[PDB]
C-alpha cells in the first residue's frame, strides 16, 4: 500500500489524455507519483473546436485523469 | 462523539430517510454499521417522481444518505449516553 501506478512502461512515450470536463490533451510522460499525478512534456491542449495549442511542460493531477492512451507502442 | 454509534442503536425503530439523490425511504431498521450502511425491513421507498414501491428488505450504502427523520418519541438523551 501507498502503491505506485505501474507506468514505467509508459515513461518518455507520447500519450493521449482524457480528462474530466470533456477535456483532452497530448504529450510525453516525464514522471508520476503514487497519486497518479503526472508530469507531461511538450503538452498540447486539443480544444473542443478542433484547434490545438502548445502549452509546454505541465502537471496533471491524478484526481482528474479519466483515461490515458499511448500513441506509441510499449 | 462518533454519532454513527448512536445510529447503530436504532435497530427496530421505524424511520424516514432522505437520500442524496432525493429518494425517500420509510422502513424499520434492522442494522446500521460503522460506515453508516443501513439495512431495513418493511420498506416503502419512493424514488423522486415515482409512486412508492414496497420491499421486504432494503440495504443502503451509508454515503448515499442525506438525513434520517427519527420517531418523535425517540429519547435522545438516553441514546447519547455511552
Amino acid at each position: 500500500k501507498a502503491h505506485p501506478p505501474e507506468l514505467k512502461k509508459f515513461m518518455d512515450k507520447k500519450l493521449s489524455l482524457k480528462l474530466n470536463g470533456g477535456r483532452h490533451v497530448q504529450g510525453i510522460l516525464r514522471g508520476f507519483d503514487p497519486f497518479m499525478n503526472l508530469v507531461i512534456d511538450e503538452c498540447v491542449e486539443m480544444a473542443t473546436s478542433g484547434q490545438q495549442n502548445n502549452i509546454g511542460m505541465v502537471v496533471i493531477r491524478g484526481n482528474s485523469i479519466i483515461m490515458l492512451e499511448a500513441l506509441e507502442r510499449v | 462523539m462518533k454519532l454513527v454509534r448512536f445510529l447503530m442503536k436504532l435497530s427496530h425503530e421505524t424511520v424516514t430517510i432522505e437520500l442524496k439523490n432525493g429518494t425517500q425511504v420509510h422502513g424499520t431498521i434492522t442494522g446500521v454499521d460503522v460506515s453508516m450502511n443501513t439495512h431495513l425491513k418493511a420498506v416503502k421507498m419512493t424514488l423522486k417522481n415515482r409512486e412508492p414501491v414496497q420491499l421486504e428488505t432494503l440495504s443502503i450504502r451509508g454515503n448515499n444518505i442525506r438525513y434520517f427523520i427519527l420517531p418523535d418519541s425517540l429519547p435522545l438523551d438516553t441514546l447519547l449516553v455511552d
Binding site: 474530466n20 470533456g22 477535456r23 516525464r30 514522471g31 507519483d33 503538452c43 505541465v58 | -
Partner: protein, 79 residues
C-alpha cells in the same frame, strides 16, 4: 524521471506565472505566482486572476490560497 511535486517546487523557485485548470469548471481558470504549497497541493498564489474563457474577462484577486481539490492541471504562462 521528473516527479510532479518537484515540477511545482520548480514553479515556486522560478516565480513563473502559473495558470490552473479547475475541476469540472471549464469557463473559468485561475492564474498567479506560486509562493508556497503543501502536501495536499494547496497553493498560495500571488497577484492572482480569475480568467473567463467565455467572456475574455479577468477578475483581480491578489493574495489567494486555492484548495487543491479544484486542481485539474498546472501550466506556466510567459505574461
Amino acid at each position: 524521471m521528473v516527479q510532479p511535486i518537484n515540477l511545482i517546487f520548480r514553479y515556486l523557485q522560478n516565480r513563473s506565472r502559473i495558470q490552473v485548470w479547475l475541476y469540472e469548471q471549464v469557463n473559468m481558470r485561475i492564474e498567479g505566482c506560486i509562493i508556497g504549497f503543501d502536501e495536499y497541493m494547496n497553493l498560495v498564489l500571488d497577484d492572482a486572476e480569475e480568467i473567463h474563457s467565455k467572456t475574455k474577462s479577468r477578475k483581480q484577486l491578489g493574495r489567494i490560497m486555492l484548495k487543491g481539490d479544484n486542481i485539474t492541471l498546472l501550466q506556466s504562462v510567459s505574461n
